Design a protein around this ligand. Sequence first.
Ligand code: ERG
Ligand code: ERG
Ligand code: ERG
Ligand code: ERG
Ligand code: ERG
Ligand code: ERG
Ligand code: ERG
Ligand code: ERG
Ligand code: ERG
Ligand code: ERG
Ligand code: ERG
Lengths: 354, 477, 311
Amino acid sequence: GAVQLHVWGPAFGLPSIDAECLAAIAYLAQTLGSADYQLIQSSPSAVPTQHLPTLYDSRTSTWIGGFTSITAHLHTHPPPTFQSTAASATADGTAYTAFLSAHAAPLLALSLYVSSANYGAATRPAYSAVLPLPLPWTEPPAVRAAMARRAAHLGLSSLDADTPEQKSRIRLEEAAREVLDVLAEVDWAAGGGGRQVAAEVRCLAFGYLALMLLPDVPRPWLREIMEGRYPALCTFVRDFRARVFPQGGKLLPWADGGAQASASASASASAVALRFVRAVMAEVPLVGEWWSRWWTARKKREVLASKGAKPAPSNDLLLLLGAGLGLTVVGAGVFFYRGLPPFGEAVQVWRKPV
Amino acid sequence: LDEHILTPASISTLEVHGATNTRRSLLDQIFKPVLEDTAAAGTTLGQVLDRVGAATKKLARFDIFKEEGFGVFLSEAAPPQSAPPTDRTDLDISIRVKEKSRLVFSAGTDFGNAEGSAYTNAVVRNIFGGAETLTVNASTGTRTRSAYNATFSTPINGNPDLRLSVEALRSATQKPWASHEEHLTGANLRLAWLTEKGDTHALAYSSVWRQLTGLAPTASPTVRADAGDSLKSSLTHTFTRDRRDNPMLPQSGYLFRSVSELAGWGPLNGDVSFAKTEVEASGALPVAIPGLAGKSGVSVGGGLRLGVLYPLPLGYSLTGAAQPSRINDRFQLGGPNDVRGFKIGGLGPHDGVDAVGGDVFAAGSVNALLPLPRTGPDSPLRLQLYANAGRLVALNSKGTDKEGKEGLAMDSAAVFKGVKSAVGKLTNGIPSLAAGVGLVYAHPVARFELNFSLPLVLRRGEEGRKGLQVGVGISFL
Amino acid sequence: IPRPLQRLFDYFPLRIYEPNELPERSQQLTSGDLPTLYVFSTDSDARLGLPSFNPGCLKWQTLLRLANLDFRILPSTNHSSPTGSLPFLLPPRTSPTASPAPIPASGLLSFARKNPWLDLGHLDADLPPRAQAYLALITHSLRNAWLCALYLDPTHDALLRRLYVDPASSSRAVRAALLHQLRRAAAEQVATASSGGGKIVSLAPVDSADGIDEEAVYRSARDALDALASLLRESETAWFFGTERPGSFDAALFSYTHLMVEYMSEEEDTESAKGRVSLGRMVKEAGNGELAEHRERMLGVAWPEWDGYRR
Ligand SMILES: CC(C)[C@@H](C)/C=C/[C@@H](C)[C@H]1CC[C@H]2C3=CC=C4C[C@@H](O)CC[C@]4(C)[C@H]3CC[C@]12C
Ligand SMILES: CC(C)[C@@H](C)/C=C/[C@@H](C)[C@H]1CC[C@H]2C3=CC=C4C[C@@H](O)CC[C@]4(C)[C@H]3CC[C@]12C
Ligand SMILES: CC(C)[C@@H](C)/C=C/[C@@H](C)[C@H]1CC[C@H]2C3=CC=C4C[C@@H](O)CC[C@]4(C)[C@H]3CC[C@]12C
Ligand SMILES: CC(C)[C@@H](C)/C=C/[C@@H](C)[C@H]1CC[C@H]2C3=CC=C4C[C@@H](O)CC[C@]4(C)[C@H]3CC[C@]12C
Ligand SMILES: CC(C)[C@@H](C)/C=C/[C@@H](C)[C@H]1CC[C@H]2C3=CC=C4C[C@@H](O)CC[C@]4(C)[C@H]3CC[C@]12C
Ligand SMILES: CC(C)[C@@H](C)/C=C/[C@@H](C)[C@H]1CC[C@H]2C3=CC=C4C[C@@H](O)CC[C@]4(C)[C@H]3CC[C@]12C
Ligand SMILES: CC(C)[C@@H](C)/C=C/[C@@H](C)[C@H]1CC[C@H]2C3=CC=C4C[C@@H](O)CC[C@]4(C)[C@H]3CC[C@]12C
Ligand SMILES: CC(C)[C@@H](C)/C=C/[C@@H](C)[C@H]1CC[C@H]2C3=CC=C4C[C@@H](O)CC[C@]4(C)[C@H]3CC[C@]12C
Ligand SMILES: CC(C)[C@@H](C)/C=C\[C@@H](C)[C@H]1CC[C@H]2C3=CC=C4C[C@@H](O)CC[C@]4(C)[C@H]3CC[C@]12C
Ligand SMILES: CC(C)[C@@H](C)/C=C\[C@@H](C)[C@H]1CC[C@H]2C3=CC=C4C[C@@H](O)CC[C@]4(C)[C@H]3CC[C@]12C
Ligand SMILES: CC(C)[C@@H](C)/C=C\[C@@H](C)[C@H]1CC[C@H]2C3=CC=C4C[C@@H](O)CC[C@]4(C)[C@H]3CC[C@]12C
């Protein structure tokens, strides 16, 4: 286990529920050996990068977050068991990676998270089934809010995701087509003809299309559109799944011999309590945003130090002593005020002048 | 009694009850002058009683005591002083007063509902036992721009007349007439002062950050050009002489109000530099029909308001290039509390539908309150006929030639010529005039008025209302 | 009931005068004989119609200049836009107190077609799907890199202040507040990106430079620049997709490359200290200078009179 990949738990008969995490899992399975990496089910609060998927290079103890960063790092520092118009192919791969991460993610967010019916039936149970007990009340809400913000530019809402209803279906179909037509020009099957893209691009495309197609939802507008209109993409997704993750991807080297047991290392009682507490203080109406900013800065400094940079020393001691001084001043003032004898008397009398 | 006021008396002891949370120095500087006022020692029961009444009226000014709890007990002084110079010369009075609640906190909260509407009203009062008052008026909307207000008031050297206030505010004013909204964020420093004659001076320093945002889709190019960020650090002086018998229903007397403001010039620093002054003069003359007796209720009132906005350079020099005024500072005319018969901001320059302001204005009014039949003159109801008129013009540099490639900068001569032309434009032509009848309600908290208007003369692009128009508030033309 | 009294309300008013003249500021700013495009620029630059320093305004200004529309530009702010964001166009006043409705960025090209100072299909033609995939690079990777380097980078603090907060107000407190909100907004946009972002910290979006991967954003920008250079190299002509005249794709790329070369192309001493190549240097070195020569050609086509465009 030279490198450890921290990803979400399995869902919808797939190794992971997140598109980027599934893409990273597929890339690792296709390139690295079975015993050269470990998969760890986790949540963003469990990793200092605060973002999944996250790779921890145990050879150097480096925290790398993001699918693109993980793929770039593994090319520069490959593990021992690594086996990955050339310029035009690289340019096409970069362009399609950017297009996927920029436009296919809002579509998946609209299908799974923005849609209230779909989120309340499959997505929320799937997220709650891969987290310890008190977490599903803090992390899935943040994930859903982030995905809704991602898909906000699409201009569609939960009501649209299903007579005005038939007008919304046209908008959904147009939004799906605007992405699927672009994605359909590439020969993701790596067969004869069509465009050619890198293995990383193919893995990312599968990661997005798998969550856009396979999950069974009460309102499968996206799955119906895909099956009806893009049989090539449906066949690519099915073949890639059946080739890379057979029997639901249970043969992957999950930590401690299982997906559920993998999370147990970082899901101790104290760790889960601390994560839940931090999530709670992050929502305080007054100091929540300041606490979140301080924690984010601390974790960013930790990640940079792990990478090898030399961040400026933190000024936490100065802030702590200033806050303590202010608290002591406030306490002294309130103690002076409390117990002060009344400023006047009940009766007040003035004698005649002398 | 009628004959009791002849006997001279002297105030021996002054006792005050129910002031357990008030500093001695507060009552010290007000009650000794009452105490030693018996120097005359002649028919004092006809003068010291009113003196004590004035003293308790001054006591009411502190706001820290309950009005319904003002008590004054009087009793002849039992000690038989040797050789009394006059009858019952020894006299003591007793004053009993109950303080208001020391902390009022009207936390109307709807935290469960999305629209919080948490109008916190911390009115912490009488801190340090010297009539210091701290007021917090924080509020929130439907997760929109939250309001914020915090005022701290304190009398100076325990003088209820001279009062110093510090305020920090954050509001969002809506301006439907000009198709935008103003976001205000700044602090003030006022020094109010009540003269013994009854006048009210008020010197205030304000440094607010204005923001024009939320433009309506029908916003005019002028409003679009004036949108952005601005800071106004100004020093303003307000003087009021209200001799009217009833401010809500002025039947006799007069009112003179002057609001002079200097912004940006000299030590003050900001994005706008001007000298704005407004003068308001009002009056009312009762008309008693000789046939009827007592207060007839018929009066012939009037009014007159003037205002000049003079652009000034930024710096310590009176001779320099000055920027033209912005829509934030320009005057607005028209409405029920203004020249009647016109829409709110219905007078002055109009860019399309937006009511942009002007630099000088001159409003006037001639009303005549009339009592309703089968109704006493003391009744707040009254019938009114008005003849409101007004003008509102904007400054421009048409007369000045050779503006230059660099614009929006007028020299002293250009600004003076523009001001002269703007003032001259008031004299030529009939002012925007409207007349109508209506009923006025003299509710003590605020005046209510509903009238049937009919515009007569107005400039093109101005808005007038020909139907029933209602008006509430305390300031009317 | 409406019929009888209407003969009385219509008689009034009795006298109507000519409308009051607009204020001096309104007469100086809103009066013009040409349509005015309101962009993020300076007073000196707007007089000569030089390119704006905001890429969003610069793209539309370049498209309008390629559309032959005779127009002028004036500095403005986001608060004055009908859609809450620059740029927008105000057609000339028909009357001294009346003006037509503002034209948003979406309707800019449609407006430019009705006033041919023609066949403007190339400026708004639908792109092929591969062209859309490549446009994703410009609209996400380059935009995120520009936003990060301009706002969240302390190196460009003086440039950001001079470009955005100094002309807004002369008050130090107001300038600081505006800078704080600008940085918050820019961090919020940058964080909504799979590369260099995507951190889950709370139910609120990330609004700080510490929740953003600057290295990932920079790497994505470099990859995007190389890919765009290769795509330009594919075309046989001097423009993208082998077109005879520049189009929407060329304008979109130019609106970022020109600004990067103009402002971010600083000295190599700063680059050597941190090992980070500046955005302008990356643009110049992408491919074999294809992006730099494309920017020069776009400048020679849309601003042929300008000559101080080097940096
Ligand atoms: C309301 C919030 C703010 C916080 C203070 C409340 C926390 C309590 C109510 C929650 C937090 C974690 C919860 C918790 C964690 C784990 C388990 C194990 C399970 O087998 C039985 C229930 C149990 C023991 C539950 C009970 C309820 C707890 C203790
Ligand atoms: C006993 C176990 C098995 C389960 C069924 C019980 C759950 C209830 C009793 C408890 C456990 C965790 C609690 C819980 C977790 C987290 C939060 C977030 C906080 O901002 C609001 C309250 C809220 C939503 C509370 C509500 C009460 C919950 C949901
Ligand atoms: C597998 C099991 C053994 C793991 C999950 C244990 C969970 C329990 C012991 C943890 C999970 C969440 C924790 C928890 C959540 C929130 C709070 C609120 C805080 O103000 C007091 C502690 C309290 C109440 C702690 C107590 C310990 C809890 C309940
Ligand atoms: C030690 C401190 C941190 C303890 C005593 C404070 C707890 C309070 C301030 C916390 C505990 C639970 C929190 C809480 C629970 C649930 C929600 C719902 C969410 O939609 C808005 C915030 C809100 C309403 C937050 C606000 C802050 C609360 C009320
Ligand atoms: C208080 C002392 C000084 C005495 C003299 C009071 C004088 C005031 C109240 C009187 C004196 C002259 C009066 C006066 C003069 C002329 C007019 C014009 C008329 O169309 C409206 C009433 C009005 C405006 C009245 C109002 C009341 C005034 C101003
Ligand atoms: C920006 C300008 C408009 C501000 C600073 C105006 C200041 C002047 C006009 C104010 C400031 C203090 C005022 C002042 C102080 C005290 C008194 C004593 C009183 O018995 C007569 C009036 C008089 C003399 C007034 C007149 C008006 C003054 C002199
Ligand atoms: C400003 C307030 C007080 C209102 C009531 C104005 C009143 C006066 C000044 C107004 C009302 C009626 C106006 C008036 C009526 C008719 C004419 C005939 C015209 O050929 C010359 C101007 C002239 C003579 C104007 C001058 C201004 C007058 C006299
Ligand atoms: C009640 C008195 C005191 C005064 C104020 C009232 C004046 C109003 C009601 C009347 C008096 C004279 C009238 C008047 C005179 C002459 C003209 C010229 C005409 O071409 C337009 C209407 C106009 C301008 C009218 C408008 C209405 C006026 C101004
Ligand atoms: C329509 C207007 C122009 C008519 C009614 C005329 C005057 C109005 C404005 C009234 C309002 C206040 C009045 C006013 C206030 C106080 C005094 C002091 C007194 O010793 C002389 C008269 C004088 C100066 C009067 C004159 C008339 C005034 C100025
Ligand atoms: C020959 C040129 C240089 C002259 C006429 C120009 C300007 C100077 C000297 C004078 C002329 C008019 C003056 C002027 C007119 C009116 C007012 C309004 C008053 O509330 C503040 C002072 C102020 C603003 C002064 C300031 C000084 C000015 C502007
Ligand atoms: C050539 C003449 C017939 C034209 C200019 C019309 C009117 C003349 C008589 C002028 C002379 C004085 C002017 C006049 C004096 C005072 C004011 C008070 C102000 O609140 C409104 C304007 C108003 C009422 C104007 C209106 C126009 C008047 C009455």
